[PDB]
Amino acid sequence: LRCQCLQTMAGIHLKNIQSLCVLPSGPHCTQTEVIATLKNGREACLDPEAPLVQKIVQKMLKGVP
Amino acid sequence: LRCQCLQTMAGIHLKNIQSLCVLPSGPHCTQTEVIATLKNGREACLDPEAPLVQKIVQKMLKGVP
Amino acid sequence: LRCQCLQTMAGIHLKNIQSLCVLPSGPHCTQTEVIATLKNGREACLDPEAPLVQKIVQKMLKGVP
Amino acid sequence: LRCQCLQTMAGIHLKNIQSLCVLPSGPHCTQTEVIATLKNGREACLDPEAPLVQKIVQKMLKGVP
Amino acid sequence: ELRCQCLQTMAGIHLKNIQSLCVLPSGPHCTQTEVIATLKNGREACLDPEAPLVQKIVQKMLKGVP
Amino acid sequence: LRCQCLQTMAGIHLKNIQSLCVLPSGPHCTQTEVIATLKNGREACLDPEAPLVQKIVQKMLKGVP
Amino acid sequence: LRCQCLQTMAGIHLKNIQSLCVLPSGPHCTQTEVIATLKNGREACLDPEAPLVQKIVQKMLKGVP
Amino acid sequence: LRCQCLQTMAGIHLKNIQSLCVLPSGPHCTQTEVIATLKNGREACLDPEAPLVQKIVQKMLKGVP
Amino acid sequence: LRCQCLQTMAGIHLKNIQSLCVLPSGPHCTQTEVIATLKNGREACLDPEAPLVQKIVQKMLKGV
Amino acid sequence: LRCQCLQTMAGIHLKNIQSLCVLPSGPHCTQTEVIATLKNGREACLDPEAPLVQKIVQKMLKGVP
Amino acid sequence: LRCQCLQTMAGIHLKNIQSLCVLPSGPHCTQTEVIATLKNGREACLDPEAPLVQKIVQKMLKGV
Amino acid sequence: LRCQCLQTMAGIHLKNIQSLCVLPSGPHCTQTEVIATLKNGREACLDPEAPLVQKIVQKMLKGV
Amino acid sequence: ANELRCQCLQTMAGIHLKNIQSLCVLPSGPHCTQTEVIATLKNGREACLDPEAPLVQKIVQKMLKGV
Amino acid sequence: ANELRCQCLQTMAGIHLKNIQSLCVLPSGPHCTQTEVIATLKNGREACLDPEAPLVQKIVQKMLKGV
C-alpha cells in the first residue's frame, strides 16, 4: 500500500491519453498522484500541481481535440 | 469495446472517493464518461458536464476533501 | 511491428531507472526510440536526441549515483 | 534477483543489434551489466567499461550506418 | 529449408560457464559450419569453429572440465 | 536432472550427423556425455573418450566430407 | 514412406532395451531395418545381419538378464 | 503401466507381418510379450516361447518371403 | 471397400472378448469375416467355419 | 459406460444386415445386447434371447441368402 | 434421392421416442416412410399402415 | 436445449409438406411441438392440439 | 440450385409481432408473379405472409411506429 | 467485426419505388436503439430509410398492394 508513482514526468499530449485516473491522499500515499494511461497501454505519472496537467484534465471533461 | 456507463448518477461526496478515472471519447464510446471508485470498492458513474463533478475533480488535485 | 512509443516524455531521474533499452531504426520503426523501465515497473519513453537523455545513458555505463 | 550475465563477450557488430538494454547496479547486481539482443533473437552480454561498447551505444542514439 | 542460426561470431567464452556446446555443420540449412554454446544461466552465444581458442575449449570439454 | 544417455553406441558416420552437442559434467551428470542428432532426427549417444568420436568432432569444425 | 534408419550403430546392451521392433522389406524400405527403443526413450537403429543383434533378439524372447 | 496383451494368439503368417515389436519383462509387465502389427494395421499378440514365433522372428531378420 | 481381415487367428478366450462383430459376404468381401474386439481394445480376426468360434458366439448370447 | 440399447425391436431381415455386433454383460451393461448395422447405415437393436435373432446369427456364419 | 428406410421394424415404445418424422411419397420415394429417433440417438423405421404406429403418433400429439 | 418453436402458425397445405416431425415433451420443452418442413426447405411450426394439424398428420400416413 | 423462382410456395397466418425479428417485402418482377412477404423470427425460422391480408398490413405499420 | 450494433449509421431520402427490389424492416431490441429500415435496390446497393418518414410509410404500403 505504497505510492504507485516514484516520480513525475511531463510533456504529455492530450490526443494520446486514453484514460486519466486521479488518486488522492490517504493511508496509501503522502500526496495526491495522477496516473495517465495512453492508447498504446503504457502508463505515465503526472503532477496535480502542474498548470498543463490541470489544463489537460478540464479539456478532457469538456471535449476532445 | 462499448461504453462502460449505461447512465449517470449524482450525489457523490469527495470524502468517499478513492479514485476517479476520466475516459474520453473515441472508437470505444460516443461521449466522455467518468468512473469514480469509492473506498469500499463500489464504482459509480458521473457526468463530465455537471458542475459539481468538475468542482470535485479540481478539488482532488489541489487538496483535501 | 509498429513503434512502441507514441510520444516522448521528460524529467526522468537516474536514481529511479532500473533499466534503459535503446531500440534503433528499421522496418519496425521510422526513428530510434528509447524505453526506460523504472524500479516500480512502469515504463517511460525518452528522446535519443535530448541532451539529458544522452547524459543519463553515459552516466549509467560509468557508475550509478 | 541475481546478475543475468555470468560473463562478458566481445566482437558485437552494430548492424546485427536489434536492441541494447543497460541494467545498472543495485540490490539485483554488484556491477552494471549490458544485454544486447540481436535481430535473430539471441541475446549477448557486453562490458560497459569497454571502449567499443561505449562507441556502439552512442552511435545507436545518433543514427544507424 | 532453414537459415543460419548465427548472424555473427563472438569471443571471450570461458569454459567454466559453458553448460552445453552444439556443433552444427554445413548443408542446405547453412553455408558454413556454426557452433552454438549454451551457458549455465541459459543464454546462448555463437562461436567460430576456425578459432584456436574454440577448438581448444571443445577438446578440453571432452577430456575433463576445469 | 539425471543423465540423458543410459549407454554409449558406436559406428557413427560424419555424413549423417546434423548436429553434435557436448554436455559436460556437473550436478546434472556424473560424467561428460555427447549427444549426436542425425539428419533424419534420431539422436544417438557417443563416448567422449573414444578416438573416433574425438576425430569426428575436430573434422566437423574444420570442414565437412 | 522412406526408410527410418539412415545408418546402423552397435554396442547395444540388453539390460537397457525397453522395446525392439523389426521392420522388414517392402515398398517402405529397400532392406530390413531394426529399431530398438531404450528405457529412457531414445531410439537406436541396429543391423539384422549382425551376430550380436541376432543373439540379443533370441535372448529377449527366452528371458531377460 | 500394465501388460498390453491380455492373451496370446497363433496362426500368424510372415507375409502379412508389417512390424514385430518385442517388449521384455520389467515393472511394466510380469513376462515378455510380443506384439505383431499387420499390413492392414490390426495388431496381434504372440508367444515368445512358441517355436513358430521364434522361427518367424529369425526369418524376418535374414530376409522376407 | 476391401476385406478388413488379411488372415485368421485362433486361441481366443471368451472372458477377454468385449465385442464380436460378424461381417457377412457382399461387394465388400469375398467371404464372411468375424472381428472380435478385446477388453484392452486390440481387435483380432476369427474363422466363421471354426468350431470353437461358433461355440464362442452361441455362449455369448446365452450368458457369460 | 451405460447400455447402448434402450429397448429391443424385431422384424429384422438377413438380406439387409451389413454387420451384427454382440456386446456381452459386464460393468458396461446389466445384460447382453446385440446391435445390427444395416447396409444403409442405420443401426437397430436385437434380443439375444429371441429365436429369430439366434437363427439369423448362425445363418450369417454359414452363408448368406 | 432414394428411400431412407430399407425395411420396417416393430416393437417401438412411446416412452423411448424423442422424435418421429413422417416422410410422404414423391420423387424421393415410392411409398410413405416414418423415421423415429430415440432419446439415445439411434433412429428406427416404422410402418405408416401399422395400427400401433398410428396409435403411437396420435398419442404423442395429445400428451405423453 | 430450449423449445425450437417460439409460436404456432396455421394455414398449412398438405401438398406442400415434404416432412413433418413431432417432438414430444421432456427436459427439452414444456409442451409437445410439431415442426413441418416444406418442399422448398422452409420450416414452419404447428399446433398438436389443432384439428386441422391432426387431420393432416393422419392423411400423410394413409396416402397423399 | 433453383434460380429466380418465388421463395414462398404458400402463405401462413397467426404471426405475432413480439416474435418478429425482421420482415422483408419482396415485390413483383421477373423473379415472381406476385408480391411475397418473408418474416424472420427471433429464433431464426422464416415464415411467409400474405401482403393482401389485413393483419399482415396492420403488423407492418405497427413495426414502423413502435414495438 | 461489429457484432449486434445498428446497421444504419444514418437515414437518406429520395428513394423511388420502381428501383426497390427488396425492403426489410428491422425493429428495436438488444441489437438497436430504434427501428431501422434497409431497402435493397435492383442493382444490389442497399440504402437506409426512416420509418417515421411519410414517403417511406407510403412506399411500404404501395409495395404490398401492387407495383
DSSP states of H1-65: ---S-SS--B---GGGEEEEEEE--SSS-SS-EEEEEESSS-EEEE-SS-HHHHHHHHHHHH---
Residue of L2, H46, G4, L55 whose CA lies nearest to H13: H46
Contacts of I54 (CB under 8 A, 6+ apart): I48, J58, J61
A21 and B22 within 8 Å at the Cβ level: the answer is: yes
Neighboring chains of M (3 or more beta-carbon pairs < 8 A): L, N
HSE at residue F19, side-chain half, CA atoms within 13 A, is 18
A19 and B23 within 8 Å at the Cβ level: the answer is: yes
| Interface membership of L13 toward M (CB under 8 Å) | yes
Alpha-carbon gap: L61 to the closest alpha carbon of chain K (Å): 5
Residue C42 φ/ψ, nearest 5 degrees: -70, 125
Grid coordinates representing E37 are 554454446
Grid coordinates representing H64 are 522376407
Report the alpha-carbon distance of residue K29 to residue J16 in Å, rounded.
18
**Contact present, H17 and H27 (Cβ < 8 Å):** no
Using CA atoms, how far residue F28 sits from E61, F1, H27, in Å, is 15, 5, 25
Residue of E25, N3, B54, I14 whose CA lies nearest to F62: E25
Contacts of E35 (CB under 8 A, 6+ apart): E21, E22, E23, E24, E46, E47, E48, E49, E54, F61
Amino acid identity at F7: Q
Strand segments, DSSP code E, in chain L are: 17-23, 33-38, 43-46
The distance from CA M1 to its chain's CA centroid, rounded to whole angstroms, is 22
Q: Give I-chain residues touching J32 at CB under 8 angstroms.
A: 60-61, 63-64
Residue of J37, J46, J45, J47 whose CA lies nearest to J16: J37
Q: In what order do the strands lie in the sheet with F43-46?
A: E44-47, E34-39, E18-24, F17-23, F33-38, F43-46
The distance from CA L31 to its chain's CA centroid, rounded to whole angstroms, is 13
Positive or negative: CA dihedral N17, N20, N21, N27? negative
Q: How far apart are the first and last CA of chain C?
A: 36
| Interface membership of N65 toward M (CB under 8 Å) | yes
3-state secondary structure of M66: coil
Using CA atoms, how far residue H12 sits from C9, C27, H9, H44, H46, in Å, is 80, 65, 8, 9, 8
Residue of L24, A27, D21 whose CA lies nearest to C22: D21
Using CA atoms, how far residue A29 sits from A6, A25, A33, E62, in Å, is 11, 6, 8, 60
Report the alpha-carbon distance of residue K26 to residue L15 in Å, rounded.
10
Smallest CA–CA distance from M62 into chain N, residue:
N27
In sequence order, the β-bridge partners of residue N37 are N25, N49
- Please name the member of N25, N29, N63 whose beta carbon is closest to the beta carbon of M35: N63
Instruction: Find the Cα–Cα–Cα–Cα dihedral I54, I56, I58, I61, rounded to 10°.
Output: -150
Report the alpha-carbon distance of residue E42 to residue E18 in Å, rounded.
10
**Contact present, A60 and A52 (Cβ < 8 Å):** no
Architecture in CATH for domain N17-65: Beta Barrel (2.40)
Report the alpha-carbon distance of residue B48 to residue H39 in Å, rounded.
77
Q: In what order do the strands lie in the sheet with H17-23?
A: G43-46, G33-38, G17-23, H17-23, H33-38, H43-46
| Interface membership of C19 toward D (CB under 8 Å) | yes
| Interface membership of E12 toward D (CB under 8 Å) | yes
Instruction: Find the Cα–Cα–Cα–Cα dihedral A51, A52, A54, A55, rounded to 10°.
Output: 120
**Contact present, A56 and A63 (Cβ < 8 Å):** no
CB pairs under 8 A between F and G: 51
Query: If you count them, how many residues does chain G have?
Result: 65
Neighboring chains of C (3 or more beta-carbon pairs < 8 A): A, D
Q: Give H-chain residues touching G20 at CB under 8 angstroms.
A: 21-22
**HEC secondary structure over chain J:** CCCCCCCCCECCCHHHEEEEEEECCCCCCCCCEEEEEECCCCEEEECCCCHHHHHHHHHHHHCCC
- Please name the member of N20, N22, N25 whose beta carbon is closest to the beta carbon of M60: N25
Report the alpha-carbon distance of residue D36 to residue D43 in Å, rounded.
6
Alpha-carbon gap: I44 to the closest alpha carbon of chain H (Å): 7
Smallest CA–CA distance from H15 into chain G, residue:
G24
Q: Give F-chain residues touching G44 at CB under 8 angstroms.
A: 9, 42, 44
If you compute the radius of gyration of chain K from its CA atoms, what whole number of angstroms results?
A: 12
**Contact present, A52 and A11 (Cβ < 8 Å):** no
Residue K52 φ/ψ, nearest 5 degrees: -65, -45
B 24-43 → A contacts, CB under 8 A: 24-26, 32, 34
Ramachandran assignment for M43, one of left (phi > 0), alpha (psi -120 to 50 degrees), beta (any other): alpha
The distance from CA G15 to its chain's CA centroid, rounded to whole angstroms, is 14
Report the alpha-carbon distance of residue A7 to residue H26 in Å, rounded.
66
Contacts of C33 (CB under 8 A, 6+ apart): C3, C4, C5, C23, C45, C48
H13 and I4 within 8 Å at the Cβ level: the answer is: no
Q: How far apart are the first and last CA of chain F?
A: 36
- Please name the member of A21, A32, A61 whose beta carbon is closest to the beta carbon of B61: A32
Q: In what order do the strands lie in the sheet with N46-49?
A: M46-49, M36-41, M20-26, N20-26, N36-41, N46-49
**Contact present, C33 and C40 (Cβ < 8 Å):** no
**Contact present, H57 and H47 (Cβ < 8 Å):** no
- Please name the member of A25, A32, A64 whose beta carbon is closest to the beta carbon of B24: A64
H9 and I12 within 8 Å at the Cβ level: the answer is: yes
Report the alpha-carbon distance of residue H40 to residue F45 in Å, rounded.
35
Residue of N32, N29, N28, N30 whose CA lies nearest to N7: N32
Give the strand pairing for H33-38 and H17-23.
antiparallel
Architecture in CATH for domain J14-62: Beta Barrel (2.40)
Q: Give G-chain residues touching H61 at CB under 8 angstroms.
A: 22, 32, 34, 48-49, 53-54, 57
3-state secondary structure of L4: coil
Neighboring chains of A (3 or more beta-carbon pairs < 8 A): B, C
Q: Which residue has 409495395 as its cell numbers?
A: N63
- Please name the member of B18, B48, B61 whose beta carbon is closest to the beta carbon of A61: B48
**Contact present, K10 and K38 (Cβ < 8 Å):** no
In sequence order, the β-bridge partners of residue I17 are I38
G56 DSSP assignment: H
L22 and K20 within 8 Å at the Cβ level: the answer is: yes
C11 and A6 within 8 Å at the Cβ level: the answer is: no
Report the alpha-carbon distance of residue M33 to residue M27 in Å, rounded.
9
Architecture in CATH for domain E15-63: Beta Barrel (2.40)
L42 and M42 within 8 Å at the Cβ level: the answer is: no
Burial of M3 (0-12, 13-18, 19+ CB in 10 A): exposed
Smallest CA–CA distance from E10 into chain D, residue:
D11
Q: Mutate which of C9, C21, C45, C52 to disrupt the A interface (most A C-beta within 10 Å)?
A: C9
- Please name the member of A6, A12, A38 whose beta carbon is closest to the beta carbon of C38: A6
Q: Do chains E and F touch (3 or more CB pairs under 8 A)?
A: yes
Q: Do chains G and H touch (3 or more CB pairs under 8 A)?
A: yes
**HEC secondary structure over chain N:** CCCCCCCCCCCCCCCCHHHEEEEEEECCCCCCCCCEEEEEECCCCEEEECCCCHHHHHHHHHHHHCC
Q: In what order do the strands lie in the sheet with D43-46?
A: C43-46, C33-38, C17-23, D17-23, D33-38, D43-46
Using CA atoms, how far residue J58 sits from F12, J22, J54, in Å, is 60, 13, 6
Residue of G39, G52, G33, F40 whose CA lies nearest to H19: G33
Contacts of B54 (CB under 8 A, 6+ apart): A58, A61, B48
Positive or negative: CA dihedral E10, E12, E13, E17? negative
A64 and B20 within 8 Å at the Cβ level: the answer is: no
3-state secondary structure of G51: helix
Q: Give K-chain residues touching J10 at CB under 8 angstroms.
A: 9-11
H18 and G26 within 8 Å at the Cβ level: the answer is: yes
- Please name the member of M7, M16, M46 whose beta carbon is closest to the beta carbon of L7: M16
3-state secondary structure of I23: strand
**Contact present, A36 and A52 (Cβ < 8 Å):** no
**Contact present, M51 and M60 (Cβ < 8 Å):** no
| Interface membership of G13 toward F (CB under 8 Å) | yes
If you compute the radius of gyration of chain B from its CA atoms, what whole number of angstroms results?
A: 12
Contacts of M35 (CB under 8 A, 6+ apart): M25, M26, M27, M28, M51, N63, N64, N66, N67
Residue of G5, G25, G10, G24 whose CA lies nearest to G56: G10
**Run of H or E including D57:** helix D51-62
Residue of N21, N1, N17, N15 whose CA lies nearest to N48: N15
**Contact present, N56 and N37 (Cβ < 8 Å):** yes
Q: Give H-chain residues touching G62 at CB under 8 angstroms.
A: 48-49
Neighboring chains of N (3 or more beta-carbon pairs < 8 A): M
Burial of B39 (0-12, 13-18, 19+ CB in 10 A): exposed
Contacts of D35 (CB under 8 A, 6+ apart): D4, D5, D20, D21, D23, D43, D44, D45, D46
